């Protein structure tokens, strides 16, 4: 019974693939590379639903010009199980069938092939076809081919990761990045930077990544998603080094730039790292997130962790770290939570500063469950050195004195901030009125 | 007005028995046993015994089940006789009787399905509202949140279709009790104050208790101007308060700035909310927030203040007030900065223009993020 | 109850008097307009779907 429904699904998917190829052809003809990006928005939906029957019929009809590509693509595809009602899907008619297929359409077909060979736990054949595709793309040189090439590199990286051979492709990615940054592509450059950062992280090679990021320049016109990936990797690399505040800022930018609905795992990743970094900064992250449904059970370790950091109890901190230890290690953060464990005092000292405008050092020692007040003295001095607190120590009376509040408005800060925002708004308008196309004479 | 079914006194006593420090009260236990024996709630007796590991009085339960079966069979027979010849009304009367008995004996699912069947058979908007109010009440007895929200939406839709306004005000009281339940104290205060002159839902609680809840929530949700212009002046809240010296003193102490007596009152109100069934969940938030509010009231008219002076005004020590003040300044609530070397509490309360500037930055940043996202999304 | 303007100073037994414009009535209007156009952007988004 379900076979007929599957058949109708296959027919509608075949028509949909026809539509994507039509869009790519229009883009290639009309000198509008962005028109492919329409063709490249529904890839996840297609992959989540593709089927062998659809793939066979598509490769059969579309590759009318029987070329070595066809001989390399068909054999992997399973043939129909004694199909009798075959309609012989024939997208290419007359001249179109005879003429060679467009580079972009062929690249897109190879992309569907590699995706299907990825969904199935069949990585060797997928990797083979992917190397072939990479060779093909590198051989050619075209614009809409470049736009598809972006996702082709993404999928080449995905397959190489699924085969755990991430190192071996570093040079290919590097040369591809070089050619891209030489040829003035934007999305390709963003993709190849992001992939290089992912490769560098996979092997915790942070110093090399730091040099790379510090030397290359992110093009200012990427997607939301490639911006999110770049921002996450830069945030992670900083947090691994000691520049906490910038890591916090870049992370929040990323979390504010991610897709709203999908990317549950991505949100999980950024949120856990944000929690850890803020904790490392002496602030207290807000409790609103922890009860969100998409991140409720994925952060319980961090919920207990913050419950511990506030009411600092090294017994409780050790209990929670030990129990949920393997998990922390799995996340890829353990090192940072350890960096916290010896900074549990900082929250308390920042609290003491916020609450009191001047306190005796002995009172601090009593409040922090410390030894002789010299230890608290030293911790406070180091703090003010770090910049976490604004104060001035004065022992001749024996009290640390917080600094008054300065009037931000009277200064010129407001002018600067509003100027930046005004510039952004005018730029939005110029872009918006530029994007218009009046083609009624199309 | 409407039948006292389910007796939410029963919900209150069940809760009280639930607390470890009230499990062993002979008077309360005997009162509940009398209630069960008087209304013969066999399923309720079984659920109680199960939860409490109470020895089952088989001798009594035998006759309990016997009578239950007798009444059930009688009601089904009356329904059959009505449906045989009688059309509508009498059949609806019998089905209402079945649902009512089922709810009385405490049988959740039986009474619930019966009320649903009555509703579907019922077309009288007054009777539809009676049914919905019964369903809300039973959803309260079992704290059935999903049932409660569904029933409230259903009632709102029927009432929006148009209905007797007595039932509108009854819906207001039910919504207010619910908002009290779910720690949305502001709506609770608003509805309770609006309906202070039209409390017809006596099945819920005594009028004294309705006003006590209204005052309790008003002093935490409203401000001093509104508090004066509603609570302390109102003819009603005063007329009733002639029989509740405690709540009257509690309110007036906060308002007149008798702080020591106000704390002495809040002490016992903590207990009067821990022992309660609808407030106990938020018994440690209400008192704490009220402490915030008093602290920010005393400090609303003092650039400086000696911690000794705070103590003598509150009749507490110095270490205690220091602890609480530092805690709440941590929480990011109160606006002041303690100084310990000299006991001064100098205020820091923020400027108006700067606050407006900061809020403009935050809100505009949110909006710009959205507009950028929207500009990008058109092409990808 | 905002009868007049100022605040005491305990301990020192002083009574300060001043004059404050607590609000400016040109930033409040701006904030309300920002909220209103947040609602308008939400509406455009809800109307951006048709494009997909």
């Amino acid at each position: 019974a379900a076979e007929h429904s599957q058949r109708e699904l296959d027919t509608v998917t075949l028509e949909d693939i026809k539509e994507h190829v039509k869009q790519l052809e229009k883009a290639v003809s009309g000198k509008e590379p962005r028109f492919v990006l329409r063709a490249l928005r529904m890839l996840p939906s297609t992959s989540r639903r593709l089927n062998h029957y659809v793939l066979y019929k598509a490769v059969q009809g579309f590759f009318t010009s029987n070329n070595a590509t066809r001989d390399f693509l068909l054999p992997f595809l399973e043939e129909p199980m004694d199909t009798e009602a075959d309609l012989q899907f024939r997208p290419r008619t007359g001249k179109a069938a005879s003429t060679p297929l467009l580079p972009e359409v062929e690249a897109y077909l190879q992309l569907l092939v590699v995706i299907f060979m990825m969904n199935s736990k069949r990585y060797k054949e997928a990797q083979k076809i992917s190397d072939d595709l990479m060779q093909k793309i590198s051989t050619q040189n075209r614009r809409a081919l470049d736009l598809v090439a972006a996702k082709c590199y993404y999928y080449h990286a995905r397959v190489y990761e699924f085969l755990d051979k991430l190192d071996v492709v570093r040079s290919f990615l590097h040369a591809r990045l070089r050619t891209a940054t030489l040829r003035h592509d934007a999305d390709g450059q963003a993709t190849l930077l992001n992939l290089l950062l992912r490769n560098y992280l996979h092997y915790s090679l942070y110093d090399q990544a730091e040099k790379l990021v510090s030397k290359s320049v992110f093009p200012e016109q990427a997607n939301n998603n490639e911006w999110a990936r770049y921002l996450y990797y830069t945030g992670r690399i900083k947090a691994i080094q000691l520049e906490y505040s910038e890591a916090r800022r870049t992370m929040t930018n990323a979390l504010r730039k991610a897709p709203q609905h999908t990317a549950v795992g991505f949100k999980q990743t950024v949120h856990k790292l944000l929690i850890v970094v803020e904790l490392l900064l002496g602030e207290i992250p807000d409790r609103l997130q922890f009860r969100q449904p998409s991140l409720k059970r994925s952060l319980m370790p961090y919920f207990l962790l913050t419950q511990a950091v506030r009411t600092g109890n090294l017994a409780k901190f050790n209990q929670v770290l030990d129990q949920f230890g393997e998990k922390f290690q799995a996340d890829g953060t353990y090192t940072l939570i350890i960096r916290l464990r010896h900074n549990v005092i900082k929250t308390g000292v920042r609290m003491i500063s916020l609450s009191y405008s001047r306190i005796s050092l002995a009172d601090i020692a009593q409040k922090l469950q410390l030894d002789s007040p010299e230890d608290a003295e030293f911790i406070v001095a180091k703090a003010i050195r770090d910049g976490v607190i604004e104060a001035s120590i004065n022992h001749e009376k024996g009290y640390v004195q917080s600094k008054e509040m300065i009037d931000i408005y009277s200064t010129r800060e407001p002018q600067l901030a509003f100027h930046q925002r005004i510039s952004f708004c005018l730029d939005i308008h110029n872009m918006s009125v530029k994007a218009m196309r009046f083609p009624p004479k199309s | 007005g409407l039948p006292k079914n389910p007796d939410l006194r029963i919900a209150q006593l069940r809760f009280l028995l639930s607390l470890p420090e009230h499990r062993g009260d002979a008077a309360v236990r005997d009162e509940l046993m009398a209630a069960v024996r008087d209304n013969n709630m066999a399923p309720y007796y079984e659920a109680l015994c199960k939860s409490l590991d109470w020895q089952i009085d088989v001798d009594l339960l035998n006759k309990m089940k016997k009578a239950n079966e007798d009444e059930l069979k009688r009601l089904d027979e009356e329904l059959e006789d009505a449906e045989k010849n009688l059309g509508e009304s009498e059949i609806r009367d019998a089905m209402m009787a079945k649902a009512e008995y089922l709810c009385r004996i405490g049988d959740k699912e039986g009474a619930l399905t019966a009320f649903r069947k009555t509703y579907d058979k019922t077309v009288a908007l007054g009777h539809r509202l009676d049914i919905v109010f019964y369903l809300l009440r039973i959803g309260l007895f079992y704290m059935d949140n999903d049932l409660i929200t569904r029933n409230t939406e259903k009632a709102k839709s029927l009432i929006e279709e148009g209905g007797d306004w007595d039932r509108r005000n009854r819906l207001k009281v039910y919504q207010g009790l619910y908002c009290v339940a779910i720690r949305d104290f502001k709506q609770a205060a608003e509805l309770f104050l609006d309906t202070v002159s039209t409390f017809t839902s006596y099945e819920l609680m005594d009028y004294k208790t309705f006003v006590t809840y209204t005052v309790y929530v008003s002093m935490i949700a409203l401000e001093r101007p509104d508090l004066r212009e509603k609570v302390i002046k109102g003819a009603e809240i005063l007329e009733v308060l002639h029989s509740l010296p405690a709540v009257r003193q509690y309110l007036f102490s906060l308002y007149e700035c008798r702080y020591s007596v106000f704390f002495q009152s809040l002490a016992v109100v903590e207990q009067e909310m821990k022992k309660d069934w609808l407030f106990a969940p938020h018994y440690r938030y209400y008192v704490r927030e009220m402490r915030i509010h008093a602290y920010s009231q005393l400090l609303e008219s003092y650039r400086s203040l000696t911690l000794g002076y705070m103590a003598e005004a509150f009749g507490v020590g110095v270490e205690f007030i220091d602890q609480e003040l530092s805690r709440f300044i941590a929480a990011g609530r109160l606006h002041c900065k303690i100084d310990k070397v000299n006991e001064i509490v100098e205020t820091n309360r923020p400027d108006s223009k700067n606050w407006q500037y900061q809020e403009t930055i935050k809100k505009g940043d949110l909006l710009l993020n959205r507009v950028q996202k929207l500009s990008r999304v058109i092409n990808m | 109850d905002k009868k007049f303007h100022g605040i005491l100073d305990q301990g020192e037994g002083v009574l300060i008097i001043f004059d404050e414009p607590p609000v400016d009535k040109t930033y409040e209007a701006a904030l309300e307009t920002i909220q209103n156009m947040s609602k308008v952007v939400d509406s455009l988004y809800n109307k951006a779907k048709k494009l997909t």
């Binding site: 509003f418 005004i422 005018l426 939005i428 308008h429 009125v433 083609p439 | 500009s375 | 156009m37 494009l51």
Partner: peptide
């Protein structure tokens, strides 16, 4: 700043309307 925000929103709305009109014209034409 408020003025510029207003203007940006209006121009974006105009772009969206033009895009929708173009899409509708293409779909009707196709």
């Amino acid at each position: 700043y408020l003025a510029s925000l207003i203007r940006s929103v209006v121009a974006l709305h105009n772009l969206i309307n033009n895009k929708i009109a173009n899409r509708d014209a293409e779909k009707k034409e196709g």
